[PDB]
Structure 1
Amino acid sequence: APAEILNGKEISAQIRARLKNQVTQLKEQVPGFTPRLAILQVGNRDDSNLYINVKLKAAEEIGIKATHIKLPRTTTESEVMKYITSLNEDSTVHGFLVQLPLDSENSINTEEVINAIAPEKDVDGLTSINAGRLARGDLNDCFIPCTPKGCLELIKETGVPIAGRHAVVVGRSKIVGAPMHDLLLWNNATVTTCHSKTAHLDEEVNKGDILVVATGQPEMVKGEWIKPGAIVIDCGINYVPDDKKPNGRKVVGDVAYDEAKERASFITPVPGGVGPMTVAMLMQSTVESAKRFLE
């Protein structure tokens, strides 16, 4: 009885399809309404361009007007701040994000920039005000970072209720681990948060009916650790050379999939699990902001 596979590519495809239908219907119910997203970029990083173009493409297909503002490497902190204030003030923009890391020849305080974003438009959900609402239970209107938001969606796709179950989160970063704990707690699971200072991590992990790993340590969580019948969500994206792959490298998660798939009731593969869910989640957060503004 091996684990059922949570196909993030298929699930995300469905989500994006539904968001398109939702966006079409919003526009028809309120003629003139245009759900709008804006992405602020500083510099010209190769990886950022690729990530941005993918977000813009997903946006246009769903019918969300996506605006890309690209500032030069010569940009200063005050200029970035000026744009954030203008985006906050632009009533035609429902949500926006600052693509990180910033690429400038000048010293720019990333944290101050991010925290200048109006909470009601913070689709990436990384502002302190937003992290604060999420951490304290205001799940009804706050924004949720794309990765942990995708993880909860995958857990819910199993059909197994979260309330009363013991969830274990390995990792406590701002991007994944911390907000992941928040989602699980407010969905009434009993949560245990582990990290690099956690003793007997194997014994801790073995207590999780729901396990979310986001450590960046390739295949560290062995299958032996997994509790029988657990839901395993793996956020790991670790590259390893493999001449037998089309591009000479394979992607492995933070969980030892091959042995974990025999223990778990549900598991996310890598690649193809949590990864494909992220852009859809941002799109979902953008539609949410648009609907809240509309009301």
Structure 2
Amino acid sequence: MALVLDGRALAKQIEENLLVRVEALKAKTGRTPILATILVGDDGASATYVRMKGNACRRVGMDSLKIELPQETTTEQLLAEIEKLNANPDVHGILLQHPVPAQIDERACFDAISLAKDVDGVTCLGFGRMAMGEAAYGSATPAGIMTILKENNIEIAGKHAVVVGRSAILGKPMAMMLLQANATVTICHSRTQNLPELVKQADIIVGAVGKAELIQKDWIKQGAVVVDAGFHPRDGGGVGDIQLQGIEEIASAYTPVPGGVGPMTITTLIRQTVEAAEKALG
């Protein structure tokens, strides 16, 4: 049977280390690390993930500054809020939960976040630096995925990694991170032809399409490493972007859904915020 890539376990483990680090920092400086979380509008999943990220902050001994803005917020209004957080020395990281209301230029607002506080890794600057091997906080989910792979001793160098999806915060950074780790990388999307064949060639497959079980189990190469970055709620167990039923007979290793990529998304954000606080308060 396939190795279960246990992101839930790894997240908890990482948080135990973060906790002692945060407590040491507070004891030395008297100051608490702070993630500013920006939630714009009433999207349910967005509310949930910000809630979970706030919880993660408190588990490791830090806190969050919760910024809640109405659905009708303008790009200019959100930019003003982000600049207030940039200029606040008490705020160490800034999260803008995506997707913001569609009238807002989300890209412009991402890029307004100062690099030093880009702990979710959403800036063009941060992306470009990461792609070219320079120090920068990585996009939360992709960086979480790399950590899962690394800490489970998964071979990446020389493997053919197929990333299905090319989103700004997930697919694109994932591809560039795998490339930096010396995988041959294929990037697919909605205009990709022969997707089943490309997926079948993959030694490592990353489902990042935001559509329930789009990647079919019979497309998966026998022995492949299967990363499912999706989540779609359902009665009696939610599912991701990949058909994972019976995956244990097919993959060499796989991330379960729930409890795989998800927990490591949140914990990666918090770890990078601790790093930012450690730097800022050191």
TM-score normalised to structure 2 length: 0.89
Equivalence for 2:80: 82
Q: Which amino acid aligns with 1:166?
A: H
Single out whichever of 216-225 and 205-214 deviates more from structure 2. Answer: 216-225
Q: Which amino acid aligns with 1:261?
A: E
Question: Does the aligned pair in 1 maintain the 2:113–2:123 contact within 8 Å?
Answer: yes
Question: Does the aligned pair in 2 maintain the 1:36–1:94 contact within 8 Å?
Answer: yes
Partner SS, residue 120 of structure 1: helix
TM-score normalised to structure 1 length: 0.86
* Structure 1 segment 247-266 matched on structure 2, within 5 A: 250-266=237-253
1:283 is displaced (CA, Å) by 0.4
Equivalence for 1:110: 106
* Structure 1 segment 231-270 matched on structure 2, within 5 A: 231-240=225-234, 242=235, 245=236, 250-270=237-257
Q: Deviations over 1:147-189 (max 9, x none)?
A: 1122112212321332222211111111211110011111121
Q: Deviations over 1:56-94 (max 9, x none)?
A: 121012112311123345655443322211211122221
- Stretches of structure 2 lacking an aligned partner (at least 5 in a row): none
Supply the distance in 1 between the matched residues of 2:88 and 2:109 (Cα, whole angstroms): 17
Between the two proteins, the alignment pairs up a number of residues equal to: 282
* Structure 1 segment 26-41 matched on structure 2, within 5 A: 26-28=25-27, 30-41=28-39
Q: Equivalent pairs: percent with the same residue?
A: 43
> Runs in 1 of length 4+ with deviation above 6 angstroms?
none
Equivalence for 2:271: 284
Q: Deviations over 1:90-123 (max 9, x none)?
A: 222211122344459xx54333222211122111
Equivalence for 2:172: 178
CA change 1:100–1:167 in 2 (3 A) is closer
* Structure 1 segment 1-295 matched on structure 2, within 5 A: 2-28=1-27, 30-72=28-70, 75-102=73-100, 107-138=103-134, 141-240=135-234, 242=235, 245=236, 250-294=237-281
Q: Which amino acid aligns with 2:127?
A: A
Q: Which amino acid aligns with 2:256?
A: P
CA change 1:78–1:17 in 2 (3 A) is same
Task: Give the structure with higher Rg (CA).
Answer: 1
Q: Which amino acid aligns with 1:132?
A: G
Question: Does the aligned pair in 2 maintain the 1:44–1:103 contact within 8 Å?
Answer: no
Q: Deviations over 1:177-217 (max 9, x none)?
A: 11100111111212111222222222222222221111123
Q: Which amino acid aligns with 2:26?
A: K
Question: Does the aligned pair in 1 maintain the 2:73–2:104 contact within 8 Å?
Answer: no
CA change 1:271–1:45 in 2 (3 A) is closer
Supply the distance in 2 between the matched residues of 1:103 and 1:168 (Cα, whole angstroms): 31
Supply the distance in 2 between the matched residues of 1:223 and 1:76 (Cα, whole angstroms): 43
1:267 is displaced (CA, Å) by 0.7
Question: Does the aligned pair in 2 maintain the 1:169–1:212 contact within 8 Å?
Answer: yes
Supply the distance in 2 between the matched residues of 1:15 and 1:205 (Cα, whole angstroms): 32
Supply the distance in 1 between the matched residues of 2:273 and 2:281 (Cα, whole angstroms): 12
Single out whichever of 183-192 and 202-211 deviates more from structure 2. Answer: 202-211
Supply the distance in 1 between the matched residues of 2:41 and 2:203 (Cα, whole angstroms): 44
CA change 1:57–1:199 in 2 (3 A) is same
Supply the distance in 2 between the matched residues of 1:291 and 1:200 (Cα, whole angstroms): 47
Supply the distance in 2 between the matched residues of 1:220 and 1:254 (Cα, whole angstroms): 6
1:41 is displaced (CA, Å) by 3.0
Cα RMSD for the two superposed structures? 2.3
